[PDB]
C-alpha cells in the first residue's frame, strides 16, 4: 500500500527528529543522520513526491510538516556544513517541500507558519552548495507565488529578500540563478519594503540591468524574463530615486528597454512596458531621452495588445511622454 509505505518513511524521520530535539534540550552525545539511514528515507520520500497519489498520502499524514522539521533540525545541528551527506539530505528534503508546496494553498501556509524552519531555509542561501541554493530558492519561489498576507509578512520578516538578492550577486551557475531570480520576482511584488531592500543591496540595480542583455547560451529567455520582472517591480521605487535612476542611465537601461519592446516574448515586452510606465512618469530627463530614442513609435503599436499589462503599460508610458 502507498499509505503504509509513506507512513513508514514519515515515522522514520519523526523518530529521528525526536532524538535530535532531545539532544537539543541538553543546554549525552550528538545523534548522527548516517547512523539512522535518514538520507535514504528522505531520498525515497523525495522521489515519491513527484507522484500525485503519493503526495496525497503525504498530505493525509502531515508529511510536509515532518520533512520540514527534519530540514530545520539538520540545519540547526550542523550549520553551513560542506559535508556531502547533510547537504544531500537537505537537497532531497527541499525538493520534496517544493513538490508538496506547488499549487497547494494549505501546504504553503503551513510551511510559512513554521518560523524556525523558514529561518533555516533562508540561512541555507549562504550554503556553498549551489545545488542546495537552487533547491531552497525553489521552495521560496513556491511559497511566494500567490501567498496569503501572513505568509507574505513571514517571508519578509525572516529576511528572504536580502538573502536572495545577495545570493543572486554571488551564484556561479545559470541554473541556480534562474530559481534565485524566480523567487525574487515573486517576492519583489509583495510590498514596498521588499523593493527597498532589493534596491539597498550594493550593486543590485546594475546587476538587474545586466540581466536585460544576459547572454543565455543555454538558448532560453529565463534570466531576461526574471531579472526584468524584478526590475519592473522595483522600478516603481526607482522612479522616485534620482541616484537609482542614474545607475540605470549609466547602464543604458532605457535603450535596452526599448529593444525589449521588439521581443517575441510577451513576458519580456510586458516587463519592459511596466518599467517604462514608471520611468517615463514625472521625470523630464528620462522622458526626453525616451523621446529622442524614438520610444513613441515603438510604444504606439502595443496599445492594442491582447495582453492587458502590455496594452495599459505601453498606453500609460505613451501618455507620460505626450503630457
Amino acid at each position: 500500500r502507498r499509505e503504509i509505505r509513506v507512513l513508514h518513511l514519515l515515522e522514520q524521520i519523526r523518530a529521528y527528529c525526536e532524538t535530535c530535539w532531545e539532544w537539543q534540550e541538553a543546554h549525552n552525545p550528538m545523534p548522527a543522520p548516517v547512523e539512522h539511514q535518514i538520507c535514504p528515507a528522505v531520498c525515497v520520500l523525495m522521489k515519491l513526491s513527484f507522484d500525485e497519489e503519493h503526495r496525497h498520502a503525504m498530505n493525509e499524514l502531515g508529511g510536509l510538516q515532518a520533512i520540514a522539521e527534519l530540514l530545520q533540525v539538520d540545519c540547526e545541528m550542523y550549520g553551513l556544513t560542506n559535508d556531502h551527506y547533510s547537504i544531500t539530505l537537505r537537497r532531497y528534503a527541499g525538493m520534496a517541500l517544493t513538490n508538496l508546496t506547488f499549487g497547494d494553498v494549505a501546504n504553503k501556509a503551513t510551511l510559512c507558519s513554521m518560523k524556525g524552519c523558514m529561518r533555516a531555509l533562508v540561512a541555507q542561501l549562504k550554503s556553498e552548495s549551489e545545488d542546495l541554493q537552487q533547491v531552497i530558492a525553489s521552495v521560496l519561489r513556491n511559497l511566494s507565488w500567490r501567498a496569503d498576507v501572513n505568509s507574505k509578512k513571514t517571508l519578509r520578516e525572516v529576511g528572504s529578500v536580502k538573502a536572495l538578492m545577495e545570493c543572486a550577486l554571488e551564484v556561479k551557475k545559470e541554473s541556480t540563478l534562474k530559481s534565485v531570480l524566480s523567487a525574487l520576482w515573486n517576492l519583489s511584488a509583495h510590498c514596498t519594503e521588499n523593493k527597498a531592500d532589493i534596491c539597498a543591496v550594493d550593486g543590485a540595480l546594475a546587476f538587474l540591468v545586466g540581466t536585460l542583455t544576459y547572454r543565455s547560451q543555454t538558448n532560453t529567455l529565463a534570466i531576461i524574463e526574471s531579472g526584468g520582472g524584478i526590475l519592473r517591480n522595483v522600478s516603481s521605487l526607482i522612479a522616485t530615486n534620482e541616484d537609482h535612476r542614474q545607475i540605470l542611465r549609466e547602464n543604458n537601461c532605457l535603450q535596452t528597454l526599448l529593444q525589449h519592446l521588439k521581443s517575441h516574448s510577451l513576458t519580456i515586452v510586458s516587463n519592459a512596458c511596466g518599467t517604462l510606465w514608471n520611468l517615463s512618469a514625472r521625470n523630464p530627463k528620462d522622458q526626453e531621452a525616451l523621446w529622442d530614442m524614438g520610444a513613441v513609435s515603438m510604444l504606439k503599436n502595443l496599445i492594442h495588445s491582447k495582453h492587458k499589462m502590455i496594452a495599459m503599460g505601453s498606453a500609460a508610458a505613451l501618455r507620460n511622454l505626450m503630457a
Binding site: 513527484f50 525538493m95 517544493t98 513538490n99 508546496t101 506547488f102 499549487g103 537552487q134 533547491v135 525553489s138 519561489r141 513556491n142 511566494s144 507565488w145 500567490r146 524566480s182 520576482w185 515573486n186 511584488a189 524574463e225 526574471s226 520582472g229 519592473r232 517591480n233 516603481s236 511596466g274 499589462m309
Partner: peptide, 10 residues
C-alpha cells in the same frame, strides 16, 4: 506589476 511563477522541478 505582478509575480513570476511556481513549479515542481527539483
Amino acid at each position: 506589476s505582478y509575480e513570476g511563477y511556481e513549479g515542481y522541478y527539483s
